[PDB]
Amino acid sequence: SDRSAQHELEKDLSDKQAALRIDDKCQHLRNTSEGVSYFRGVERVDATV
Amino acid sequence: LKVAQTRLDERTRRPNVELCRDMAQLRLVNEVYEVDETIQTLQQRLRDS
Amino acid sequence: PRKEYEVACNTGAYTSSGLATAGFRTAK
Amino acid sequence: SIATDNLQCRERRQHPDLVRDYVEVELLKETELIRNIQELLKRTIGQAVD
Amino acid sequence: APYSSRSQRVCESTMLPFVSNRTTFFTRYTPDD
Amino acid sequence: SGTLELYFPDHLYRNDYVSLEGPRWAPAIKQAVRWKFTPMGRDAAGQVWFTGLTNSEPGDAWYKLPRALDTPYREAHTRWHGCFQSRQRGLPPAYTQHLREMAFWDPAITAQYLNSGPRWGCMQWRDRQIRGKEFVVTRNQ
């Protein structure tokens, strides 16, 4: 029981890291930094859990 | 308009748990609509000039 | 093995599955 | 508003009945159809103003 | 048989629930896919 | 009709009706009581457990000041929700009710009390250029 619960916390921490890299390299972005482009429809898309 | 709307699309690659809608989504869609409106009014006034 | 048969029952291209091998399963 | 309230109310069920039955499929189809229809109405109002 | 069921056997076994709190249904894939 | 000189290429945001599927997943909420089997053994118990700040704790005040150690005061959620409320109070109310569970919000994103322009208004004063009388701008305001 201890090892299974500890697995659940490990995969939660992994998903936290997968969010952190996106938020880190998103919020360091400045005006015309590198590789920015026109995208369209993202302001239309709102998926949320 | 470049930097804000590619900020939106470069954000929206997120995984399942953190696929959400915070204030950043709402502020960014308001940003891109008002920058678009500024483009149309400056284009019209250039035409009248 | 009944576990292998049950997960082979559950797998598919567009089919949701709740069984999880060597761990807890979904509440739904 | 009615559809999203049905979604949260039916999602608040207990453990031996939290089932992805046909009701939840039809509720998701309702949410999708409502949002598509009202966005189409938004574009039609724009064209009729133009 | 008493040893034909252990924790290492029903920990493997699949008809028992052992459920978690996630409700998302992940998908599996085939190597040719 | 004539020879129009134009000087700008930016687009104008229309004429793309895309059939959108993809926001298809069961939404996540805050629950109160969940269930567990605590060991994997021949010993096994079906135990319910209730979460902390949901239904068992209360907000701070000076009459309830120090703490009771028996109380389920979840400090992490308390601090996070305090800073969340501090950041939350800045947005106006339609953007607050979009962060609720049920969909009581207006479907069109720009609000009535913030937008200076009328939504889907049909009036637009266009002055025809004719030699002679005086041309002018901003007849709306």
Chain F nearest CA to E32, separation (Å):
25
The chain A residues in contact with chain B (CB within 8 A) are 15, 18-19, 22, 26, 29-33, 36-40, 42-43, 45-49
Q: Please, what's the b/e burial string for F37-49 (b: 16 or more CB within 10 A of its CB; e: otherwise)?
A: beebeeeeeeeee
Distance CA F31, CA F15 (A): 43
Distance CA E12, CA E6 (A): 10
Asked if B2 is an interface residue toward chain A (Cβ–Cβ < 8 A), one would say: yes
Distance CA A15, CA F75 (A): 23
Q: Specify the 3-state DSSP secondary structure of C10.
A: helix
Whether the Cβ atoms of residue F2 and residue B37 lie closer than 8 Å to each other: no
| F121 CB-contact burial (10 Å; exposed 0-12 / middle 13-18 / buried 19+) | exposed
Q: Specify the 3-state DSSP secondary structure of A23.
A: helix
Residues of chain C neighbouring D13 (CB-CB closer than 8 A): none
According to the entry, how was the structure determined?
Answer: cryo-EM
Q: Specify the 3-state DSSP secondary structure of E9.
A: helix
CA-wise closest residue to F120 among B20, B22, D41, A46: D41
Q: Specify the 3-state DSSP secondary structure of E19.
A: coil
Considering only CB atoms, D8 lies closest to which of F23, F35, F102, namely: F102
Radius of gyration of chain F (CA): 29
* Distance from the Cα of residue C20 to its chain's centroid: 6
Asked if C24 is an interface residue toward chain A (Cβ–Cβ < 8 A), one would say: yes
- Token pair 């938004």 is found at D42
CA E11, E14, E18, E22 dihedral sign is positive
Q: Note the resolution in Å, 1 decimal.
A: 7.7
CA-wise closest residue to D15 among F101, F47, C20: F47
Residue F45: which residues within 8 A CB-CB, separation 6 or more?
A: F37, F38, F39
CA geometry: angle F124, F128, F132, nearest 5 deg: 140
User: DSSP letter string over chain B?
Assistant: -HHHHHHHHHHS---STT----HHHHHHHHHHHHHHHHHHHHHHHHHH-
| Torsion from C-alpha of A28, B13, A13, E16, nearest 10 degrees | 180
CA F26, F29, F31, F34 dihedral sign is positive
Tell me phi and psi for residue F36, to 5 degrees. Answer: -160, 155
Provide the pairing of β-strand F46-50 with F33-37.
antiparallel
- Token pair 């959400």 is found at B20
- Token pair 């809608």 is found at B21
User: DSSP letter string over chain F?
Assistant: ------------------------S------SEEEEE--SSS---EEEEE-SHHHH-----STT-S--TTS---HHHHHHHHHHHHHHTTS-HHHHHTTSSS--S-SSSS-TTT-SSPTT----------SSSPP------
Residue C16: which residues within 8 A CB-CB, separation 6 or more?
A: D20, E25, E27
Radius of gyration of chain A (CA): 17
CA-wise closest residue to C8 among C19, F137, F99: C19
Q: Which residues of B, range 5-34, sit inside 8 Å of F by Cβ?
A: 16-17, 21, 23, 26, 29-30, 33
Distance CA F12, CA E10 (A): 63
Q: Specify the 3-state DSSP secondary structure of A42.
A: coil
Q: What are the CB-based long-range contacts (under 8 Å, 24+) for F66-70?
A: none
Chain E nearest CA to C7, separation (Å):
8
Whether the Cβ atoms of residue D27 and residue D7 lie closer than 8 Å to each other: yes
